Amino acid sequence: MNIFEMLRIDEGLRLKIYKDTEGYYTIGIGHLLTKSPSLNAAKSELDKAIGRNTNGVITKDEAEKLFNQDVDAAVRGVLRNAKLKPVYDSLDAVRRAALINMVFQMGETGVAGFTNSLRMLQQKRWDEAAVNLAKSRWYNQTPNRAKRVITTFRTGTWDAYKNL
Ligand SMILES: [Cl-]
Ligand SMILES: [Cl-]
């Protein structure tokens, strides 16, 4: 297990434009295109993202290319954020992947707002952090996925992803 495998499980793989859990146009491995309700707008973003006139369908290779870019960007955002970096730096590799997961899902800004949870994580108060994490819109809207991530922070193991 690693961040790529983890996110591939949490995000799936779809080669045609579809709507994510929030109703937003996405493609590939959780690559958010736009929050716009306009499919055309989404197609335009896709084309720009891939570098070609696609008409809403991409190849597996293409999907993976955006995925790699997206994971990289997530990590990059964590390292640049004053709130996140310190936590990230304080974590072991498994846990670091769980934080990246959250950032891919909600963005730098969104995770940076989990102030209290972040603090518990930096204090290495696993159970408490887990409890706190669950008190969020994130957990309520995507409970199975959140549970997986939370378990990862709680245990520092990949048990939640084991066998998926
Ligand atoms: Cl992009
Ligand atoms: Cl879920």
Ligand SMILES: [K+]
């Ligand atoms: K998805």
